[PDB]
Structure 1
Amino acid sequence: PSMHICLDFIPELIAQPELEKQIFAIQLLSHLCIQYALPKSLSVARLAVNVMGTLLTVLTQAKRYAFFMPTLPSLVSFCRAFPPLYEDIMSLLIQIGQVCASDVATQTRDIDPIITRLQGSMDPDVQLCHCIERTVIEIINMSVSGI
């Protein structure tokens, strides 16, 4: 029960260069926001989404996969905690979705997820797109059943 203190220094933690540390920070913030819903928690959850937007611009694809696949399922937790912090979530999700989609066409693929629009060990980008689709399904479900 004495772990709420983390909301103090998570802002300092995210500033660390190590992608591993930042990925951990966002994941931790996800569960802290669920358990505690305080103005400080939201003032930090907003910064989390802003940092994710920034790293979207500043990250090559080889690390974009490794940094976005294990942190995206964190966003449904933010949405569960804070309906107010919702349009930003959806904007970032659609942005990352279509940037990954655009990157997909650059090099020939065997599944070509584009035709899946009207709907194993695959390529990183295909995995990333499937992850984003799953997260959107999950956030829609949580919003429908969130009362």
Structure 2
Amino acid sequence: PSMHICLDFIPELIAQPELEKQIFAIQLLSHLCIQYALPKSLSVARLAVNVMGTLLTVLTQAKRYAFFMPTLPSLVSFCRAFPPLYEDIMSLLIQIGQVCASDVATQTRDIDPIITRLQQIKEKGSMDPDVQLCHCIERTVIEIINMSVS
């Protein structure tokens, strides 16, 4: 029960030059928001969404993949805990998606996930990192939609 105090050093943990510290801070804040619901928690979650959105344009592909693979369930839990953030998250997701839409078309692939736009989700191996990131984005959006609709 003494985990809420960790919020007081969650932003300080974000402003770190190491990507692992930032990912861990984002995940810890995600769990704290899915556990505790406070206006301060909402402010820290908004700051985390902002610092995640500003890190999309200052990271290379090899770092973008490793930074945005674990941190998408964090956005899912942020949506589950804070309704008013929905739009922002969606916008953010869209941006990231479009970035991936430009990363897959750059180099030739083996599965070609571009034509898979007209596909549906099926309830419920070794691939390309960009294709894996696209699939992770799609899956997290599906979970967000299923949580908000139900």
Asked if Structure 1 and Structure 2 have the same fold, meaning a TM-score greater than 0.5 normalized by the shorter chain, the answer is yes
Q: Alpha-carbon deviations, 1:93-142, whole Å to 9, x = none?
A: 01101111111110000111000000911010000000000001000000
Deviation at 1:47, TM superposition (A): 0.5
> Offset at 1:10?
0.3
Q: CA deviation at 1:73?
A: 1.2
Give secondary structure in 1 for the equivalent of 2:17. Answer: coil
Q: TM-score, normalised by structure 1?
A: 0.97
In 2, the alpha carbon distance for the partners of 1:90 and 1:116 equals 20
Say which of 117, 120, 130 aligns to 2:125.
Answer: 120
Distance 2:15 2:5 in 1: 18
Structure 1 residues 111-120 or 122-131, which shifts more?
111-120
Matched, 1:130 2:135: yes
Find the aligned partners of 1:6 and 1:131 in 2 and give their Cα distance.
28
* Separation in structure 1 between the aligned mates of residue 83 and residue 66 of structure 2, nearest angstrom: 28
Distance 1:51 1:38 in 2: 20
Q: CA deviation at 1:25?
A: 0.3
Query: SS in structure 1 opposite 2:83?
Result: coil
Show the 5 A alignment for 1:6-45.
6-45=6-45
* TM-score of the two chains, using structure 2 as the length reference: 0.95
Percent same amino acid at aligned positions?
Answer: 99
Structure 2 spans left out of the alignment, 5+ residues: 119-123
Gap regions ≥5 residues in structure 1: none
Rounded Cα–Cα distance in structure 1 between residues aligned with 2:80 and 2:12: 24
Show the counterpart of 2:87.
87
Q: Does 1:50 align with 2:16?
A: no
Q: Distance in 1 between matches of 2:116 and 2:142?
A: 15
Aligned equivalent of 1:103: 103
Compute the displacement of 1:85 (Å).
1.1
Q: Which deviations, in whole Å up to 9, do the C-alpha atoms of 1:48-107 show, x marking residues without a partner?
A: 100110110110001111110011111110001110111110000011011111111100
Counterpart-to-counterpart distance in 2, 1:47 and 1:18: 18
* Alignment partners' CA distance in 2, 1:70 and 1:78: 14
Which consecutive aligned stretches of 4+ in structure 1 deviate over 6 angstroms post-superposition? none
